[PDB]
Ligand binder design. Sequence first.
Ligand SMILES: Nc1nc2c(ncn2[C@@H]2O[C@H](COP(=O)(O)OP(=O)(O)OP(=O)(O)O)[C@@H](O)[C@H]2O)c(=O)[nH]1
Ligand SMILES: [Mg+2]
Length: 161
Amino acid sequence: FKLVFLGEQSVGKTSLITRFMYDSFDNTYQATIGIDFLSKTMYLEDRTVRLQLWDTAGQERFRSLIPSYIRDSTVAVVVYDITNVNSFQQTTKWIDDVRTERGSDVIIMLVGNKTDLADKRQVSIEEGERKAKELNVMFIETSAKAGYNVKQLFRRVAAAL
Ligand SMILES: Nc1nc2c(ncn2[C@@H]2O[C@H](COP(=O)(O)OP(=O)(O)OP(=O)(O)O)[C@@H](O)[C@H]2O)c(=O)[nH]1
Ligand SMILES: [Mg+2]
């Protein structure tokens, strides 16, 4: 259960981790610098699991040694912001990066985060599911802020292993 979180800056990667691991959320953006690590045991879908999580920096300058982390991980979590079409469009790139490194020997979850921002939605659930089916990855929509589907994201990934 070695998980790498990928996707564009400000989509909610860190926020999803903090929500799941610590059940908190904060509004003010602290960008991740390089690749942070968190390891903890959780009771997750009826078994104990040791979660080893790599939280990558979305900012372009930090995207050089990510290959090692992708090779090191059994699960890739690729997140976008449902309010931000570019961030969605860039998920093809991220999934490709995983595939280039592991092909079919990896669990991939595509995540449409920030659903609580309902009015500002620029990507439909439909389009998200479409992309997930086309690229053969799992799909879920979450809200780190409101606490929607975050436990489910980790559940579905843990039951995928
Ligand atoms: N409304 C809303 N805001 C969110 C949600 N998730 C994250 N945010 C906000 O969006 C901003 C970015 O969140 P981060 O968790 O720091 O995003 P990130 O993907 O880790 O960004 P980098 O580390 O720079 O790559 C912050 O201001 C968060 O408070 C969400 O589910 N809903
Ligand atoms: Mg971050």
